[PDB]
Design a protein around this nucleic acid. Structure first.
Lengths: 65, 67
DNA sequence: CATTTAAGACGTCTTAAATA
DNA sequence: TATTTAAGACGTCTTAAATG
């Protein structure tokens, strides 16, 4: 299971749109899309911000634990 | 606190008495990458930041922001 | 509406060379 | 040996548009 799949699953659990997650993290909606689809992976600062927005650890996102 | 991430990385590497190349090996990157991070030329990506934090036994938030 | 695609700017890595 | 500089490959973001 790719990190992107975990990001999408956690976003869906929170019941929010990509743009809303983007605003929380400090990136565009498109960035969220790219991560969820595994087009790219978040950089250091964005991974930590994303983990906080998604209420999980960065290790959970990166490796499913 | 208000230093750059690179300054915090170097201070903790030196405290642990680890060379850049050795730290690179532990993290899964080249010695040059460690040098770039320490000099604030670049910042580690997601995977590398977490690997770096484990190698240095500090939180990723400490390295990134000093908090 | 909500998300993906496209193009492009700039960041994050690599090895080889230069430094001392 | 230890680190920095140089040059190049590919990665991570942006906005506009297309697709959904």
């Amino acid at each position: 299971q790719l990190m992107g799949e975990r990001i999408r699953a956690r976003r869906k659990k929170l019941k929010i749109r990509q743009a809303a997650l983007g605003k929380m993290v400090g990136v565009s909606n498109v960035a969220i899309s790219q991560w969820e689809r595994s087009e790219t992976e978040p950089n250091g600062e964005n991974l930590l911000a994303l983990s906080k927005a998604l209420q999980c650890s960065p290790d959970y996102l990166l490796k499913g634990d």
